[PDB]
Design a protein around this ligand. Structure first.
Ligand code: MG
Ligand code: MG
Lengths: 47, 805
RNA sequence: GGCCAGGUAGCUCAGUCGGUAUGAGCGUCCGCCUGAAAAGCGGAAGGUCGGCGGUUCGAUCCCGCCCCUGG
């Protein structure tokens, strides 16, 4: 879409950075459970 | 190390002693190759054809030009009115295919180096092919560091005179350079004897014409050798350096303040060269300085303080011999591949210093209209030296014959050594050889042997196979690496050559701890990639890299292996001081050098991804699983003729529930199994990637001598079902059954693993097929059951097994 | 180091001086289809546009240094 109107009212980057920060947290959160469940999962008889 | 010259100039110096000598350029290159001179490239000049002649410009129109070619034409940067130029009129051809009221050619457009010929080079209208000498051939030679004397026409002409057995006239001799009068010193001179200078000569030339230019024959030879000709006094110093191998430099005599001094740089001085840049100096650098500023860097670069310009009327040339090591360490730091420095670091004949000076002073005055001052300052050390010959070398007369394996005709060694300039005397059957001053590389009998052999030609050396020494063949370990490679390839693995350079933070991808022993790597100062300077502690990163290349290019079902050594330092990179080369290092000095090195053991590793069994008419194939990595271990173990035991273990980058530590006896030898899923995702590897890595040096060599005795009596077949906790490995139960069953047990195989509610939770039932056989009798069923019950009891005590009820 | 054209999806490469890379071909996934496939048709996934900084609400695109290929 002037420098006006192309600034405030277009600074939804905070809305995108907040939606990202919610994804980056859950990505690190869900990655931690997978790595934890691997340490407690039933192993195989390697022999 | 390059040396470029035209054939005409080289043939001229050879023709002085052998008149009429002329050879095909292919023969010349072949002869130079046969005596040890790498001919990098042979460049013929031009060629032109048609109306390409010379002419003088008559008028300037600021650009139109009027050139008198018996005719008069007009043709449209670096030329003034009256200069002779090369003209190419529209007619026949031109080097490069470009067909040309014409064109004023340049040195690059003529395939020779716009080009301005000096006044008097030729008559307007002369055929430019002959004026420029296009029938010439420029030779590009690679000179080895032992033949610094070949960085000149003098050395190469002498070499050709040796090869063709010709009479040679040294261009630095007194008949080609008659000594100039010495009626007094030329300039006050002082030299610190600790500077390493061997000679320092000085002779001036007064009243030179600054409007005088170099003749065409002198400018053409400088250009065909790769040196841009600007003005005499510097054209003659480069011409003499090219002709005789002695580097020459000309100062402005009217720009030298006080006495000339040669000494080491005190602390961090600086100097502005002819180019015009301040260069940081070292306390071990030699320079020529005056009472005003620095005149030149010793045998490396001249300074603009005393450099001659276009206003110079009095020149003072300095013929000096500098330390080759001092010039080498100085030219490399400042990125100065100077023609003077490249020759000084490879030694320069110190006996021709005054002869090369007299050639410079005389040639400059003959073309620039000057006067040679009958004065010379010739410093030759303290005390003044008069014999620059290397020390004499004693060698048996038939020593070259023995080393060559050829019975040369008598007098061959003496003739060849005299050909290259050495004085040879006889004492019974022992020669005493004093090399010439321009051959400091000749220090030992081996150096003399090479001179005889290369001149006679290595082609005359017969091919005589030496007798076979009673060797022992391949070592046990070397045989094992072959068997391991053969067995893995026959099992469907493809060998790769692993790179020893670790990927960018590969261990960070594996999630290894900061204190992981694999992270203690040996780093590289100058890697090919600045993000991969670490050496390989494990073969897996290289195999996993090669796996990604295959999968990313459509080959998704892969199994690769590699048998190569790794690098494992036990401390920070420690250095060992220099041990004298003139003697053998003691066994304690050897052990000190080994301990300062990483351990570096031989490893075998493998990676697998995709389908382990390809699909086909039999069925859809089987994807790779951890058991395929364990089977690779058993393939390597069978090839090594050892028994391995696998135990569950946690060890990144492997999956902790799908990882086995491999043991030979009680020694850990590596790991195997499936890779950690987080490591796979963070590395871009295929899902379910499996890997193996064993230390072959930790696996002892074994050569068992079995003595089987086949029992002719029948066997008894029995099966036993045992219930154990889920964590009990099946091999542990098999070992306990074997230990209890005794010597009657001939074979045991697991064929059933059963779980379910019939068996307790977190328990499993294993059924083994047993084969009993006595060596001296037929068994009753009770005999076999007795051995089975003892095996059941042993499994109960060792793994808590319960007989299936 | 100098000077330069480049680095863009799994492969090979186009394309853009501020909000869409409508990226292409092939590779990957789903559907129709087949006993199961492939093609075909239809529908999707996937790029921190070389790294690190600088400017703006916002940079693959503009500034600086640097990593590696042709140079
Ligand atoms: Mg030699
Ligand atoms: Mg489909």
């Amino acid at each position: 879409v002037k420098e006006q109107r192309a600034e405030a009212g277009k600074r939804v980057n905070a809305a995108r950075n907040a939606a990202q920060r919610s994804y980056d947290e859950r990505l690190a959160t869900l990655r931690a459970e997978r790595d934890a469940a691997v340490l407690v999962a039933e192993g195989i008889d390697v022999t | 190390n390059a040396m470029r010259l035209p054939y005409s100039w080289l043939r001229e110096v050879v023709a002085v002693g052998a008149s009429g000598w002329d050879v095909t350029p292919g023969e010349l290159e072949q002869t130079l190759l046969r005596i040890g001179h790498e001919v990098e490239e042979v460049i013929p000049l031009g060629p032109v054809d048609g109306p390409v002649t010379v002419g003088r410009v008559a008028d300037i129109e600021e650009r139109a030009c009027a050139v008198d070619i018996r005719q008069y034409r007009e043709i449209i940067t670096n030329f003034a009115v009256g200069d002779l130029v090369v003209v190419a009129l529209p007619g026949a051809t031109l080097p490069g295919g470009f067909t040309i009221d014409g064109m004023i050619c340049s040195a690059a457009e003529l395939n020779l180096g716009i080009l301005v010929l000096p006044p008097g080079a030729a008559e307007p209208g002369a055929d430019g092919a002959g004026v420029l000498g296009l029938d010439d051939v420029v030779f590009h030679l690679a000179i080895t560091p032992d033949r610094g004397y070949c960085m000149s026409v003098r050395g190469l002409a002498r070499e050709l005179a040796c090869a063709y057995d010709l009479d040679f006239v040294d261009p630095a001799s007194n008949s080609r350079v008659p000594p100039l009068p010495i009626e007094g010193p030329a300039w006050p001179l002082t030299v610190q004897p600790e500077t390493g200078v061997r000679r320092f000569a000085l002779r001036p030339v007064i009243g030179i014409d600054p409007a005088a230019v170099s003749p065409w024959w002198l400018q053409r030879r400088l250009l065909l050798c790769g040196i841009r000709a600007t003005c005499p006094a510097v054209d003659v110093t480069n011409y003499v350096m090219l002709e005789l191998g002695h580097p020459m430099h000309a100062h402005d005599r009217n720009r030298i303040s006080g006495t000339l001094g040669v000494r080491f740089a005190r602390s961090g001085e600086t100097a502005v060269t002819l180019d015009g840049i301040e260069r940081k100096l070292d306390t071990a650098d030699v320079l020529i300085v005056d009472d005003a500023a620095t005149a030149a860097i010793g045998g490396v670069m001249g300074a603009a303080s005393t450099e001659v310009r276009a206003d110079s009327t009095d020149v003072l040339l300095e013929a000096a011999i500098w330390d080759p090591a001092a010039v080498s360490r100085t030219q490399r730091r400042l990125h100065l591949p100077s023609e003077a420095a490249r020759r000084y670091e490879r030694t320069v004949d110190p006996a021709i210093s005054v002869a090369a000076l007299d050639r410079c002073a005389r040639l400059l005055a003959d073309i620039a209209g000057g006067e040679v001052s009958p004065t010379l300052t010739d410093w030759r050390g303290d005390p003044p030296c008069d014999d620059w010959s290397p020390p004499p070398i004693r060698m048996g007369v038939d020593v070259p014959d023995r080393i060559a394996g050829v019975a040369y005709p008598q007098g061959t060694t003496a003739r060849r050594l005299a050909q290259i300039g050495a004085v040879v005397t006889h004492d019974g059957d022992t020669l005493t050889v004093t090399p010439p001053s321009w051959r400091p590389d000749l220090r030992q009998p081996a150096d003399l042997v090479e001179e005889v052999l290369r001149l006679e030609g290595l082609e005359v050396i017969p091919s005589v196979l030496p007798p076979a020494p009673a060797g022992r063949g391949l070592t046990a370990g070397q045989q094992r690496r072959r068997t391991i490679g053969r067995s893995l390839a026959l099992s469907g693995y493809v060998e790769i050559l692993p790179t020893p350079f670790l990927p960018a933070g590969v261990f960070d991808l594996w999630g290894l701890e900061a204190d992981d022993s694999r992270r203690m790597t040996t780093r590289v100062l100058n890697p090919l990639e600045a993000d991969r300077p670490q050496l390989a502690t494990t073969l897996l990163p290289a195999l996993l890299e090669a796996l990604v290349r295959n999968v990313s290019r459509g080959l998704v079902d892969v199994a690769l292996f590699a048998i190569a050594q790794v690098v494992q330092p036990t401390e920070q990179t420690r250095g060992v001081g220099l041990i004298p080369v003139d003697r053998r290092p003691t066994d304690d000095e050897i052990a000190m050098l080994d301990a300062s090195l990483p351990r570096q053991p031989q490893h075998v590793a493998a990676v697998l991804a995709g389908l382990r069994e390809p699909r086909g008419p039999w069925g859809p194939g089987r994807p790779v699983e951890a058991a395929d990595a364990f089977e690779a271990v058993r393939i390597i173990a069978r090839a090594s003729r050892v028994d391995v035991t696998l135990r569950p273990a946690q060890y990144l980058p492997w999956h902790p529930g799908r990882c086995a530590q491999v043991f030979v006896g009680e020694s850990s030898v590596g790991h195997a199994g499936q890779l950690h899923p987080a490591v796979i995702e963070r590395s871009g590897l295929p899902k379910g990637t499996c890997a193996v890595e064993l230390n072959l040096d930790a696996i002892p060599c074994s050569a068992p001598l079995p003595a089987p005795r086949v029992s002719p009596y029948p066997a008894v077949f029995q099966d036993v079902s045992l219930v154990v906790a889920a964590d009990i490995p099946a091999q542990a139960v098999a070992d306990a059954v074997r230990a209890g069953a005794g010597d009657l047990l001939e074979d045991i195989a697991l064929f059933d693993v059963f779980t379910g509610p019939q068996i307790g939770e977190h328990r499993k039932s294993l059924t083994f097929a047993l084969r009993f056989r006595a060596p001296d009798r037929t068994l009753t069923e009770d005999d076999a059951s007795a051995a089975r019950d003892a095996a059941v009891q042993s499994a109960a005590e060792r793994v808590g097994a319960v007989l299936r009820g």
